[PDB]
RNA sequence: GAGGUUCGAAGACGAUCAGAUACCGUCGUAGUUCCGACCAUAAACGAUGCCGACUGGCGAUGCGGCGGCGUUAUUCCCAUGACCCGCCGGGCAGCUUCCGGGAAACCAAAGUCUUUGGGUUCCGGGGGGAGUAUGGUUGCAAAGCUGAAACUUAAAGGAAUUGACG
């Protein structure tokens, strides 16, 4: 059972906000993993990437503590990456999913060239880069599938990108920032400023502002 | 040396006083067994040790009020101080000490008000590197 | 994003800063959207409606926002001729 | 050190000049 | 930086030419040495006569005798 | 020194629009500048620019909008033979769905789409998208 | 790993600049480098001030001062506790605080 | 910052700009039509002089030259206003 | 805000501004504030344009008023000169106050006693109380401030250019905001002055 | 070639040390000093090629100019000159910041780089072997410059982390 402490939390559980597009729109911090659990019930299948044991050194032996990465996505728009370090593998994983859940974003997908059917690839050639490593996502005509290393494939397959050729380099071994560079790749699809956008925004109220009556609850 | 106080005492002590300022006094053995009433202090050492600050904070209070403290009179006292005010704080009677340039600001406004303006002295500036 | 059948794809259309026309992040938390009221015209009194008004993070952390609030506000007839 | 091996070789080569030039 | 110009097709070619005698993997292949040095004269395998059997001692971390042939 | 007066200018009008600058002037000016900026005007990539006529070279002052992500310049003007035009617009523009390689052919300065309608090649200048 | 942006040195805009040999180790150092105390010690010191002010033939009398420009190489500056050895944030804070 | 109407710069903030940096390059110099006490004759002296400006008459000497503007001699007037 | 007619600057108001010295800025000048100044005198003290000073003041009003629920406006002061002030507009409007320590992520944290997801900050000095501004980067928090000439404008919706130095002047601003925010909508005529004096708004030093 | 103030490789003794052909001492040659030829290298270091464009603050200062508001002086003013307050060019520099960079340390620039090309010079391609051998050349010579391979080798290294020992 909930006890949503955040207002954005409260609004979610009373069928008040209709689709999380209404959150992303206003750039609001999700801070309760259960929110995304309302709003993508089922779907949202969660793949561990790696369990790499870090370990810090001390007067007696080495503190060893695990780092789990988890990827999350619904093969349809939304994906996330969660990195949690803990003393134990099951704690890490369980509590990384909780972050991945939080830090999911939508990916804008576009179109090869002929403007027909449904969106199978990335709009532009976005890049994303995490400390050395960098990953470029090139648009892709249908049927091609994903054309990358395992790890970005496992994040892109999740995003509901169907097709993409990539170009990556740095120290691609270092999985964390194989995956975190190609987090910021697929974040920056929706940051790509194309003509297709280019219309002045109509603008709308806000969840806090429309439903300010229900937050001062009755 | 032997005895500086522990935070089980420092916290409980401060919290009794916050809640029973009127009940306590500046003796030991009185407020000593007030603490037996208003609390469930298990050990005699602690029971007794607590009336430690219960006194050391009354000896402070009469002399002065703590910068951070729990009290009922002080909060009541603070409200009274706030209410008192001059009839007009900013009225400044008639005649403000105004720079000629400040007079210039008014002119752009186009407002007209009483005031003599004085500018004097060399442009010394501020500070001596 | 239409296609053959004028078909509006893309699960949302983002907001877009008023000051830079630059598209405002999904997780750009230093965003704003300032709502500013108008008056009756005669007496005073917010009664009526609303000058909504957004700004990105980058412009905030640059230090501007208020330069770029004014200029918009005084275009929109809220502020006037200082 | 660096300085005292560059100075080793610039003494040692000078011995191969001397050794060589005999023949 | 790089030379970048439009009638610079040589300064470029001749740049990317010599800055291969600093590659290691080509200075095997294109110099001479290799063909001259490897008993296998550029040849995949080769035949030879066993002149004695010699045990070789493996490199420290792994102790053992390796059992080879002088050919 | 000033070798190429585009690269000069286009750096400074990419390099404002990052900062969100409302408008910028471009110091040297040229015909080629004007003629390639007026291309950017049509697809929206900038607003109206107003060229000063200092008696010597020219200055321009470009109204920017938010819309230009980058404009750049291919510095040597390679000769584009129409079969290559694709291979370029593959590896020099973010998608096949927008992005404009401004170049300079037989029939004036223009984007790559307009050289393709007229079926001409010619010399690449730059690209905005 | 440039420790001091400056290089503990205070050159900038030059080249070889006068070397000066220390007042302890006799060790050679640049002028811009090197710690430069300048002591204005009283001659008589704290104790004798009043022995000497009795025995003075003259009346009142200010007494002089030695104006020595001490002038240490960094080695002796650290060994003999003129400066010390600070934290990474602290290394920067160039004020001189009594 | 984010809105400087470069094309219509207020008159003050070109005079605090180096001559060539301005919106249009103009000079920061001038000629002055100079009296001097003896003769009534007026010479057309250029502020930034370089040379010594002698009187059309003879004896007197108008302008010692210095770094920037010219040093007028002792008691003589001038007239900017033109163009 | 740009008071085209009715909500103009008036005369009784101006004399307050002069009396307290709210136009007498600091010696130095953060450039973001060269829109809101006319001269420096000699000595080297900058002079704020009481006209812009006000327009802005209303601009904050328009924005606070905008807030449907008046008790989701955080009102901060860390420096003491506002301490009293903020409590008193907060009581006047029915907004929510923070005097003393901007406490650890009252904007972030779903566990600390204090969080608050307020929809607008108001601050005495951006210079001093400069956490909440920065926490207001992690939530989508607009932000009114009571800037000086020497004040950075990282993270401010809107800057009200003032003194925010001599307690005397500070209060005034916390008044006029309070005043306007109740004139706009609330419960004041426009024609008549307040029951409420300034004297209530600008702190007292140890005095009696 | 001139000269021999000190200091001082080398060099001589005294100590110290298990030893010190080292440091710590006491002597003192070449040289450090001059004038005339060569040599042509530094951690010759901002470990940042040169020219050119663009992008933020804020303080200071050297020079020049410009403007202003000061006055000490300096005289009846002056001219000055000396301080004050500004602006302007180009100099040496400082701080500060989520520009933007940057593996990192850091960097108004190392910024404008998968959003890849303003011009151009040099130059690196795992570590050693090796700056060696050999060849050529310059040099009176130390040496300078040009400059390989077989062989061996898995890391050597850089930036930051905890350790832990000084
Ligand atoms: Mg013989
Ligand atoms: Mg040097
Ligand atoms: Mg000699
Ligand atoms: Mg000795
Ligand atoms: Mg060298
Ligand atoms: Mg570099
Ligand atoms: Mg490149
Ligand atoms: Mg090698």
Numbering used by the authors:
A (entry chain SC): 59 to 276
B (entry chain SR): 1 to 129
C (entry chain SV): 1 to 82
D (entry chain n): 2 to 24
E (entry chain SX): 2 to 72
F (entry chain SW): 2 to 130
G (entry chain Sa): 2 to 99
H (entry chain Sb): 2 to 84
Reproduce, without paraphrasing, sentences from the article in which this PDB structure was first reported:
Here we demonstrate that endogenous SRP is efficiently recruited to mammalian ribosomes containing a transmembrane domain (TMD) inside the ribosomal exit tunnel. The cryo-EM reconstruction of this native complex provided the first structure of SRP bound to the ribosome in a ‘scanning’ mode. The SRP density in the matched scanning mode structure was found to be remarkably similar in overall conformation, position, and relative occupancy of all domains. Similarly, the entire S domain is grossly indistinguishable, indicating that the TMD-interacting M domain of SRP54 is positioned at the exit tunnel even prior to engagement. Relative to the engaged state, the scanning structure showed markedly underrepresented density in the region of αC2, but clear helical density within the SRP hydrophobic groove (compare top and bottom panels). This suggests that in the absence of a TMD substrate, αC2 shifts to occupy the hydrophobic groove. The structures show how the hydrophobic cavity of the SRP M domain is occluded by an amphipathic C-terminal ‘placeholder’ helix until its displacement by a bona fide TMD. We envisage a dynamic αC2 helix that transiently exposes the hydrophobic groove to provide opportunities for nascent chain sampling. Hbs1-DN binding, observed in both cases, reduced SRP recovery by up to ∼70% with the scanning RNCs, but had no effect on engaged SRP-RNC complexes.
